[PDB]
A paper describes a structure:
Sulfonolipids are unusual lipids found in the outer membranes of Gram-negative bacteria in the phylum Bacteroidetes.
The histidine tag is not visible but the rest of the polypeptide sequence starting with SulA Met1 through the carboxy terminal Arg423 are resolved. There were six molecules in the asymmetric unit with an average R.M.S.D. of 0.4 Å. The SulA protomer resembles an open fist with an extended thumb and contains three domains: an amino terminal domain extends from the ball to the top of the thumb (residues 1–60), a compact core domain represented by the bent fingers (residues 61–301), and a carboxy terminal domain that lies along the back of the hand (residues 302–423). PLP is bound to the central core domain that consists of a seven-stranded β-sheet with six parallel strands (β3, β4, β5, β6, β7, β8) and an antiparallel strand (β9) and is flanked by α-helices. The α4 positive helix dipole participates in neutralizing the negative charge of the PLP phosphate and the positive α5 dipole terminates with a parallel π-π stacking interaction between the side chain imidazole group of His140 and the pyridoxal aromatic ring of PLP. Dimerization establishes the active site by forming a surface to enclose the active site and creates a hydrophobic cleft that leads to Lys251 in each protomer.
Author numbering:
A (entry chain A), B (entry chain B): 1 to 423
């Protein structure tokens, strides 16, 4: 008998504890200070960040800041007490659902209290052990966690690969008639890691051959792809091909909560069956009011999406002009691929921050093979072109030191929060 | 092959759709309007509700409403953009963690974005397929969903029964030595349905005969039980016996989010491993700010808890005086058990609302067996004794008509929202 605490204590605490030791406050859990935007303060110094997922610049929008301040003053954050079924239902929650459904072009929408929870329970509600899933290998964690709720069969197809898909689809369809069940395909509109867009058009094209249901997570696509920001589905003209459309307020909408879209009969079922919404609190009113304003601005200002993509093409082409390796990305997500070890990537970053005033996260060995280094650059419509130029310039300096072994000469910096204790 | 949409379109949509047709807006998704409190408006009429779980009356506390309004004005509702590990970490999140851990008397706390997914992931990283879980049969849905992620063995013990417990620990410990793993017990501090309390003091006494770890969901106990509202653990004086203490802001705290408490080494492990925290947005600042005020008020005002329990004892004893059945509740939860069918329960409630101005939910046949009718009465420190007397009076009238047979003479009322469409 290995006691649970004992195993987690040292046997599990030791390997990842080293990362915590030197990263807490700097490489993990940084503390950005100030109003939300490209220009914030880190550790006493003003900096230019590319780490926020706020694509449309709505976070510090004066109109958004008013609506947020006004809704909280009127309703407080106590807001609709209790779950939506029990006591937390308001006409404002229903107005936002009507406007969201109208925007993305489906019958109905259900305002969710949180994205991660919502996904877990849509996957829970759609699936029965008879049915069979086919999901993209790069699926977000909430999709994976929702899939672990399923006692049925699951088939994983290689990332955005229509050959493994069509292939695994045949295994699903074979198992589906044997088990007397249906088949469900889950992919994303915009994959946040590599930045590539889900090939939705080629996936609905496969609906001619295999007879399936399609679930799409457009968390990174809403406000950013398609007509006026309507998302990746609109971008491919497949809004009718996607049966269930999931979306979150975290990324473009600069906020909290989520919504799922589809036909009225199904959204109503989800209303009465989604455990994560039956048995947890309703989305607060201040968010509801603020989301109403945010959705108003996205509708009224299609310029925000344009300006974002102007920064996207400028940054992406500018980086590719100077031999920087941007991944296979058709979205604003701009990851910069490089080579090096932990002491190189760590020292690289403190050079970018303490010397060039550039703030970005890095993806390193715990996630990506040792030797790989990804700078995660996320352009927002709040960025300027001076921002783009300064960053590419500072990136160019930083690369010369990396390729010239200068960072390999230095040890891992010690920049963790003073006072942080691992035990 | 049964298409997933067809399995739910008419086959799964038919039975519960009738409930939706007549309940939506009245019995299913009521729209309480006004400031949060015992006296709000429903369908044009002012009413006295017992439906919100704001035990300490903090929701509309002026100091709380200022803190909420002030934090939103300063930070907006987007203020911690991105997940906590990436960009959403703030010193205010860490202040609230330090104050919460100090209150409930554990080493460390991790502020979560939402209780439901928080639980799903604390169960996630606590367990491996070798370990074995013993959980109370009445566990909340998020606990159930949480251990559906567990690919190992699970043993369910009968509600608050220390004999069916011991038998399953014996089965667990036996399987734990064969599988070379540990044991974990999950129960609740206050069970929200029947109102009865978890026998925590006894549960930790079983730690003499078996070596397990204990996880407790105090969602209904915080602010409500124990010294100054410290919760059910403090109420039994077994805070040291609870290894992992989960809690939510949705009930007494009158808000959004949650927190888990325990030793620093574990809370740090959870900080770096909880999927629902790594891969979802951080708790907004206005809530952080507000939660700091709410925790200040709880510490500074221990009569909020006493005023609550004065209303509890008055209401419960008054109902027991008049032969109403309150059940086995130890907590503020006051469920009133009665007998009847759906047309009786529904017309009972219409009478309570449209004639007596009393707002409460009912639990009906899909969940509890046909025959029982429980009114869910939730007392709150904002309730008056006049509130208690009027309700018991109205309850006494309503009961004479129920046992008399008047309600059985009427059909199921039609009171759903005009405009709601089932499909
Ligand atoms: C309220 C509730 C939760 C969830 O809290 P939320 O923050 O609303 O998700 C978890 N467990 C229990 C017992 C609850 O009553
Ligand atoms: C951020 C994210 C979510 C979750 O959004 P939250 O509201 O923060 O929980 C879900 N799916 C994807 C792809 C995401 O990037």
């Amino acid at each position: 008998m290995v006691d649970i605490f004992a195993r987690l204590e040292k046997n599990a605490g030791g390997p990842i504890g080293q990362y915590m030791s030197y990263a807490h406050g700097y490489f993990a859990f940084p503390k950005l200070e100030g109003e939300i935007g490209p220009h914030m303060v880190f550790r006493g110094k003003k900096m230019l960040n590319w780490s926020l997922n706020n694509y449309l610049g709505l976070a510090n929008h004066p109109e958004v800041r008013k609506a947020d301040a006004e809704g909280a003053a009127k309703f407080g954050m106590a807001a609709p007490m209790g779950a939506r079924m029990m006591s937390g239902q308001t006409v404002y929650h229903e107005q936002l659902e009507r406007e969201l459904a109208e925007f993305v072009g489906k019958e109905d929408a259900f305002l969710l209290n949180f994205g991660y929870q919502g996904m877990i329970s849509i996957i829970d509600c759609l699936l029965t052990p008879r049915d069979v899933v086919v999901y993209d290998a790069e699926a977000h964690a909430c999709i994976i966690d929702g899939l672990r709720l399923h006692k049925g069969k699951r088939f994983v197809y290689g990332h955005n690969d229509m050959d493994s898909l069509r292939l695994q689809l045949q295994h699903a369809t074979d198992l589906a008639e044997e088990q007397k069940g249906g088949v469900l395909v889950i992919t994303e509109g915009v994959f946040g890691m590599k930045g590539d867009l889900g090939k939705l058009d080629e996936i609905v094209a496969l609906k001619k051959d295999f007879q399936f249901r399609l679930l799409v997570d457009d968390a990174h696509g809403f406000g950013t792809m398609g007509e006026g920001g309507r998302g990746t589905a609109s971008h491919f003209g497949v809004t009718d091909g996607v049966d269930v459309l999931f979306n979150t307020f975290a990324k473009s909408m600069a906020g909290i909560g989520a919504f799922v879209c589809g036909p009225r009969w199904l959204v109503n079922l989800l209303r009465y069956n989604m455990r994560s919404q039956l048995y947890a609190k309703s989305l607060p009113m201040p968010m509801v009011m603020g989301a109403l304003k945010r959705l108003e601005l996205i509708r009224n200002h299609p310029e925000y999406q344009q300006k974002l993509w102007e920064i996207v093409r400028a940054l992406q082409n500018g980086l590719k002009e100077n031999g920087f390796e941007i991944g296979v990305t058709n979205s604003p997500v701009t990851p910069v691929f490089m080579k090096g070890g932990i002491p190189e990537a760590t020292n690289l970053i403190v050079d970018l921050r303490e010397n060039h005033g550039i703030f970005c996260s890095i993806v390193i060995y715990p996630v990506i093979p040792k030797g790989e280094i990804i700078l995660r650059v996320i352009p927002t419509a709040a960025h300027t072109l001076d921002d783009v130029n300064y960053t590419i310039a500072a990136f160019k300096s930083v690369r010369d030191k990396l390729e010239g072994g200068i960072y390999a000469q230095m040890p891992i910096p010690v920049r963790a929060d003073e006072g942080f204790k691992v035990r």
